[PDB]
Ligand binder design. Structure first.
Ligand SMILES: Nc1ncnc2c1ncn2[C@@H]1O[C@H](COP(=O)(O)OP(=O)(O)OP(O)(O)=S)[C@@H](O)[C@H]1O
Ligand SMILES: Nc1ncnc2c1ncn2[C@@H]1O[C@H](COP(=O)(O)OP(=O)(O)OP(O)(O)=S)[C@@H](O)[C@H]1O
Ligand SMILES: Nc1ncnc2c1ncn2[C@@H]1O[C@H](COP(=O)(O)OP(=O)(O)OP(O)(O)=S)[C@@H](O)[C@H]1O
Lengths: 570, 145
């Protein structure tokens, strides 16, 4: 009744509404739907964040400013609150006398009140249905595109009374103009200086890095949060910024989606040129693999990466034991500081056609639909990741197609329908396909010979549609004598750290490191023979003296050599 | 010949019982099949991503059909519609890219006959959807050799 004078036009009269910009064809349709004699009820429908509550706040800022037609001049936009009409309506028929007491004194103005039911689908609200049809209330609803479907589309006699005046998500060029007219609201709440580089590069950066939101709600937020970060650094304890710049926008996105465009200029760019030194600390050999990996991480940090495809999509073809999933563990240890920070997926677990429903999730109406699948879910959670599709050698095209879109255009949709973007991820696919051809025919193949053998899967798979998408087919060579002599003192260095925590300190001999480098050398089995020679020649002799109290903690366990048999003595 | 079906019918002067264009884009790899669906969607709607791109990701299954048309009534994903059906109810004039359509199950085409001739695909909820104004492109890789 008169507990409801909720005047959205006096909020616009007192300057308490944000200025709306450039939706002059959805307001012009909102106006002209509101000016017809039967069911003048527009419904600003559209995705969340798009700008459809802030069209009625641009009606209210045009009605109060006289940019409307002169039959709509001097109206009143009134935001009807569903919550305030149902609150306290405990007794029977209190809500109906409350709503009729609204409908009565909407009629007393004789059509000079434009009602605004924001979040229209909340209309307890059973009885407006005849008055909405005659044009007795001018009722701008503004519900989303999925909440109109599951409430108002269910009442098929109620969605007749409403004209959807669909509010499309604006472009980047329409969001920069939206943002150039809104920054004086955020330059004045935060007392900062949002510069025009921080607006062109906040509707650009959020329009590409953000996919879970709309368009006008992402760029506007970034600037809202970069300004509240600058005001934080203005206050808390020239050199300081009074000014939101385009680098401050990227810092707000770097810690919100993974990696910025601009935080690099100090010591991260030093350790990106030191990447092949940092990756060779754990993957010795395979310069052609470490260079092809580190170039793709440099191509993205320089902003040079194709923004539609992933950062890098590699196929790691080689023999066994040569470091194909050691590179992907040394890559994720480089950029995420943990080996188990890949989205690693052993491809050998899905040998069936039904096993492709665990990477994308079950379709609507099945078990495990509501849980997604752990490729698209683990990438929707953390969008900048490394995806290890380890041991990628299956005989099913249905499970391979999934990667037809991950690697080209960088998208892959849930069973739930949510499209997950892979354009910021590094997809690595380490199979074993040139194995008996890299070993024998090594030299001047230049990935043109083992790539025929990954091409020639086409009796089953590896369709040329798929190899055309992967960015680097990578040559992994077998390990030589000098390589496994240096994977020795990696796995040896990895063993003393397993013993300092026990409290035992080991010195290695210069021949004991030469025994494992000649006993654990096998050309066909890579570096796992050395990984087994250590756990057979120097760890089983250690454990019969670590258990048996023969080796006290603290004294230096000298790994001397007996008659070609490594002995642990203190 | 994709700017001839949108040229026959801008206001609509094609057959008004079948879509604006139904195209199979057959070819080798890397030739521009999916790029024509992003240069046409950029021409009509001023954005490459302004088409209904259904990759045939998980379309081989024995029921992925309910992914792009919707679950049956009373099932778990029922109230969220289907991917193809809701995107054309929401905007009837779109481009629909069906990427690598041969990599889908034959049960996918058995509901995709209804959009190609009748121009109208009923869904799992049970409402009929006008595809008579959309452009349905099916890129595929058959005949590549
Ligand atoms: N054309 C515009 N001009 C100025 N600000 C805009 C414009 N469109 C959107 N905004 C701003 O975008 C933000 C969110 O938009 P809203 O319209 O309030 O929410 P919405 O789009 O209605 O989505 P909801 O959550 O379903 S109400 C607000 O800060 C608005 O001021
Ligand atoms: N080039 C290398 N540099 C350092 N360690 C290596 C190298 N190659 C193998 N290793 C070691 O051997 C193991 C790695 O084997 P993986 O590389 O995971 O198997 P793969 O080489 O990828 O081939 P597979 O059997 O087809 S998975 C780990 O213990 C690594 O420490
Ligand atoms: N005719 C063309 N004109 C311009 N760019 C092209 C053309 N053909 C291919 N390209 C480029 O090649 C890339 C991949 O080609 P796409 O057309 O996307 O894939 P496709 O040609 O449809 O074939 P697939 O793998 O079977 S889906 C595109 O991103 C373009 O950059």
């Amino acid at each position: 009744l008169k507990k409801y004078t909720i005047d959205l036009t006096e909020r616009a009269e007192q300057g308490k509404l944000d200025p709306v910009i450039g939706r002059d064809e959805e307001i012009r349709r909102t106006i002209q739907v509101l000016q017809r004699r039967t069911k003048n009820n527009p419904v600003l429908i559209g995705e969340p964040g798009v700008g459809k509550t802030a069209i009625v706040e641009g009606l209210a800022q045009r009605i109060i400013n006289g940019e409307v037609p002169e039959g709509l001049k001097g109206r009143r936009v009134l935001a009807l609150d569903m919550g305030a009409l149902v609150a306290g309506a405990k007794y029977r028929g209190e809500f109906e006398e409350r709503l009729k007491g609204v409908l009565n004194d909407l009629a007393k103005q004789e059509g000079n009140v434009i009602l605004f039911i924001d979040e229209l689908h909340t209309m307890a609200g059973n009885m407006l249905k005849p008055a909405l049809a005659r044009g007795e209330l001018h009722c701008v609803g503004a519900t989303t595109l999925d909440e109109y479907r599951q409430y108002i589309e269910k009442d098929a006699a109620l969605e007749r009374r409403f004209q959807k005046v669909f509010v499309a998500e604006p472009s980047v060029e329409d969001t920069i103009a939206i943002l150039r007219g809104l920054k004086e609201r955020y330059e004045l709440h935060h007392h900062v200086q949002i510069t025009d580089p921080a607006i062109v590069a906040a509707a650009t950066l959020s329009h590409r890095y953000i996919a879970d939101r709309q368009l006008p709600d992402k760029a506007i937020d970034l600037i809202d949060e970069a300004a509240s970060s600058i005001r934080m650094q203005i206050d808390s304890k020239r050199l300081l910024r009074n000014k939101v710049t385009d680098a401050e926008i990227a810092e707000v996105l770097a810690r919100w989606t993974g990696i910025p465009v601009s935080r690099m200029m100090e010591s991260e760019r030093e350790k990106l040129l030191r990447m092949e030194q940092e990756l060779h600390h754990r993957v010795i050999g395979q310069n052609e693999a470490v260079d092809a990996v580190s170039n793709a991480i440099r191509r993205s940090r320089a902003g040079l990466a194709d923004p539609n495809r992933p950062i890098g999509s590699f196929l790691f073809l080689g023999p066994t034991g040569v470091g194909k999933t050691e590179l992907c563990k040394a890559l994720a240890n480089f950029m995420f500081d943990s080996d188990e920070a890949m989205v690693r997926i052993d491809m050998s677990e899905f040998m069936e056609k039904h096993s492709v429903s665990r990477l994308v999730g079950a379709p609507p109406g099945y078990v495990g639909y509501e849980e997604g699948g752990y490729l698209t879910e683990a990438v929707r959670r953390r969008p900048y990741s490394v995806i290890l599709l380890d041991e990628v050698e299956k005989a099913h095209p249905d499970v391979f197609n999934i990667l037809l879109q991950v690697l080209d255009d960088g998208r892959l949709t849930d069973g739930q329908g949510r499209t997950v973007d892979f354009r910021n991820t590094v997809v690595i696919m380490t199979s074993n396909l040139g194995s008996d051809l890299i070993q024998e025919r090594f030299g001047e193949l230049d990935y043109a010979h083992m790539k025929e053998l990954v091409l020639g899967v086409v009796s089953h798979n590896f369709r040329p549609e798929f190899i055309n998408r992967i960015d680097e087919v990578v040559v992994f060579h077998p390990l030589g004598e000098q390589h496994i002599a240096s994977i020795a003192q990696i796995q040896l260095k990895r063993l003393y750290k397993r013993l300092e925590e026990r409290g035992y300190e080991i010195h290695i001999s210069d021949e004991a490191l030469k025994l494992l480098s000649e006993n654990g050398y096998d050309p066909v089995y890579g570096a796992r023979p050395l990984k087994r020679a250590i756990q057979q020649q120097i760890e089983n002799p250690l454990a019969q003296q670590i258990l048996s109290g023969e080796l006290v903690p603290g004294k230096v366990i000298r790994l001397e050599v007996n008659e070609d048999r490594i002995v642990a003595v203190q």
